[model samples]
Target: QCNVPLGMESGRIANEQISASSTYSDGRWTPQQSRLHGDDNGWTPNLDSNKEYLQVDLRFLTMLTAIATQGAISRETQNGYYVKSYKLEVSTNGEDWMVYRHGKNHKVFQANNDATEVVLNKLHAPLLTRFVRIRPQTWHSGIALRLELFGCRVTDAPCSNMLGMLSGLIADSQISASSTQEYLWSPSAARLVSSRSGWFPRIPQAQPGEEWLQVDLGTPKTVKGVIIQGARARAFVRKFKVSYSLNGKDWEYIQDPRTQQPKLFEGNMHYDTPDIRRFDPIPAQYVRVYPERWSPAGIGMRLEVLGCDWTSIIRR
Candidate 1:
């Protein structure tokens, strides 16, 4: 019922495969004509009858908020064509159709002939459909319409989960390592926590429980996930323990989801893809990673902490 024109997001319009009942004439009006420039160009179906329909196949699932429709006003016509009334329908497959309507009253939306643009916002709920059809029951001369669908993609993962990790961390001046200073080969523990992948922290000829790194997050934050990367493909953390602290003195284990006990990584050694861990949100101001067993190649790795900030999600 709303007539506010909305813009298409992503490649929804360009990627759609369009088809219609028929053409206005042989030369100009075609189904694909509406896919491009609005106003001046649109699809004008032939007068098979007063009832005419245009349908679009979106290829994959799409989450739609509104459909912006523009009535034909480009060329001269005997009746000066515009859609007076119409019904919008959606489908998952191509065959079955469901009439999109208002919640309780079930109101059918219609575009005004006087108005050039009309936006059919989702009536009762958000539409998740692969096929859309607009049928004009009454028009001035022939059916002419330029269309645009607006909303985000439903086929992809929701963005709320991929929030930020670095934003929640207010300060990081207090950082320590069990062993330090290798110049180029093993820089500072700060280098391991950095966003850069090339740099890392290392302890030369590290013994079991001797090589470890810890950070102070300034304030308590809900930790959701962690990503650890090695300096080289074969060089990585073979075994390690994830621990957290409130005052940096007393440490508690970050329990593994599968085992429900203190989380400890053993026999884990792949440097190409960073080892990613996600768990129920845990509150901690201090986080530490201790190497239990070193990779045969070396004992150096990069670290990235991830979680949602108090206000919103952030990424490094």
Candidate 2:
């Protein structure tokens, strides 16, 4: 077993969930201390500073992600359809495209007749294109369905940000897809190297200008801070702390707010990547990220907890 110090663990790679890098697990997970029972479309502060912008390589490794979100499928009609075929097209300007589908080389089928899930993989390409345009060759016509694509290097954010945010840290983003849809934008797809299951969380689509993801490290560790890219500094999250818990039943709070809440509505817009922890370290096994609420039903994108940085316990 690897029993590294607090600050070291902060940058160490976790193989699974419960570690700084773990995202999902088969075992039951303890919830973070606070819950957002009220309010919608508001930004919540986190335990550390989040900088923007990062980099990812889609060609180097086999990076796959599973996509699932509440709004992607229609609850009213449990009856959904799957696509028998999926094709990808590419273009430099979203026009003058090339047919990039693998043809019968790859096909997508609906899960039980619903359009909730679609397996996303690297499509055939030519000319080393920059963008991928996807269309489902088949689907149930009557039902207008929103889909969540999984099995990719990056899911919600762009590849750049996912990689940049976790620079030097054990966890990093594995990004694929040079092009981005308006709905999902992660600069880098992050990876956690720990023992817990590495499962990325899934969130619903965006509501135009209001959308973001937040995470809290239950215990404070020597955190270098966060970096946000792609469209960095466009928006900022709030509150940083380092809480502690042994049994995961009780939490000891550390790092209190000093300055008044920053005005988020107007700004130059950039992502921050800090190089050191903001405060003294504490002991923690689980972390929490409070999400600012949004509509249960909307059209845009879904937030998915991508796979772990290391081999996952569940996969094992």
Candidate 3:
């Protein structure tokens, strides 16, 4: 729901990835010059009358939340040039583009009012995109812009974007387990929500300290964390650990950050409340939960995994 700057000013975004429709000069008013904190000679078209644009490639699908823009002072005459209003365009693939809009109307954002001042505009609904372009509509001189994007990496957010399980968008059929009860305690009923009866282990067959539950993501996914909840009654998992597999044949336990030990994640305290335990991202197709302790009453649990899809991370 919250976001951070996508590193245009920090150079985490490479110079080669920034591009422009046209340049005022060979390098002075190029796309790389459009970075935030840039004061002199930012991006513009070859001709003053042309519709110039500045764009950046994130190289991977990202959730964009906000944009900041600044005007540039002339390197030649020291005159101020700023974009007064601009429209944003987004693309999942470079071949297709869509204007960022609120409902049916195109959202026109007001840009820099001064050559040196930075202006930020917040987009309430975060955009999932790979390419972002800024097109200046109204300007003071010839449109000149320096910019930055605010967002979190797709790998850092859940696959349902946010509120993944509570909303039930992930579907109940994806969940499975080794030992589930025959009635309402089936694994298919194990869904984390505001409240639920959840899944219960068949007491006689299931080992209190060794019972395991797992979910299949259907595809390889970058699992970042788990949201755990106890049963509706007095049952809950106490100490639990995680194991993941890419091919389902080779399994590996998530390691503790300090050592090679298998990380034991803390589970819910109150049987009715839900909590989250997280770790570094792990690429997996299946993730299992091994219970080490449980309430004296029984082993009852409902859960949801957090993190993005494996393909959300792209490398060139």
Candidate 4:
């Protein structure tokens, strides 16, 4: 089994690469709350050219969408690009700015619109600034702008171990990566899987090439069993591995073949082993899967995993 690959390069201004904070920003956004802006319209400071910082409260909204739905990807319509760089600013009041987060290179395709969406982490940690703004660093191909907003939570809770999750997917081909969705259930939780039509499940028919689903368990939580549902149209699998960490810097692989147990309940029939090694808590931050291979048609997988926290209750 392999680990999940971290997608997209970390950085600013799209082409300009930078270091990504190993940990997700701490905060939350209100779900479904949208704040839209039209061409030539936005907070003050004229994001089109000025360099100013605006404080944003993760509550009212989290994920956002920017578009040239008004026209084409031209200069007269909007900023000339799709979704460019978005700066996230934090402040105690409207005065001093502390943390600033930037998102770059969001282009438009099917239509002349760009979308940036995510679930916020913390919700009610009151600390705000009345003035807030989003400056577009890059536009897809237009002068006109049409935008949409989505809200999510930035939680301080534990995130699931990604290594454990990815190993499961690599052993079984029916699984793939999810978009920005939340692992912990919350009103403002952001979506992690990429599939909007359904849970990010990988099946026999799923595109081959390298695929993955990286879960940001907020901080990092211990894992138990990685149970997933595969398409019943093919053969069943019996081998997989579970990996964990306390600090993302170090990794531990639980591959005794004895830790492999059978997912006998829902006919899943997958095998895994629950060998507890760390019995001494390991500090883990992030987890990933290396979906280096696939089964073409065996059991396309459906999301199902058991951890030190939740999962057992659902299965039981």
What would the TM-scores of all predictions be? 0.43, 0.22, 0.53, 0.25
Cα error, residue 113 of model 3, in Å, equals: 1.4
Stretches of candidate 3 exceeding 4 Å from the true structure: 158-316
Tens-place lDDT per residue, model 4, 17-135, is 11111211221111111123222322222233424322233222122222122222322333334334344343222333323322232221233344322212221222212223333
Full-model lDDT for every candidate: 0.58, 0.25, 0.76, 0.29
Q: What TM-score number comes out for model 4?
A: 0.25
lDDT score of residue 223 within candidate 2: 27
Best by lDDT: 3
TM-score result, candidate 1: 0.43
As a whole number from 0 to 100, the lDDT of residue 316 in candidate 4 is 35
lDDT of 2 by residue, 161-272 (tens): 2222233232222222222343354423322211111112232333322333333232222222222111110222222232334345785544344643321211111111
- Residue-level lDDT tens digits of model 1 in 1-316: 3222233332345534788877777646677666423534577887745467888877654556666666666564433446666777776456545566565443456665543655454544555556878787666655677667655542133212322222323333555566654544322333432323323344444676666766666666666656555543255677788788766678888777789887776523344324455556766677777777767766666565555434334686
* Candidate scoring better on TM-score of 3 and 4: 3
Each candidate structure's count of clashing pairs = 5, 77, 0, 77
The parts of candidate 1 lying over 4 Å away from their true place are 1-12, 36-40, 48-50, 74-79, 103-106, 118-122, 155-316
Better of 2 and 4 by TM-score: 4
lDDT, ranked from best to worst? 3, 1, 4, 2
> Model 3's lDDT to the true fold?
0.76
RMSD of each: 15.9, 23.0, 14.6, 18.6
**Alpha-carbon lDDT of model 2:** 0.25
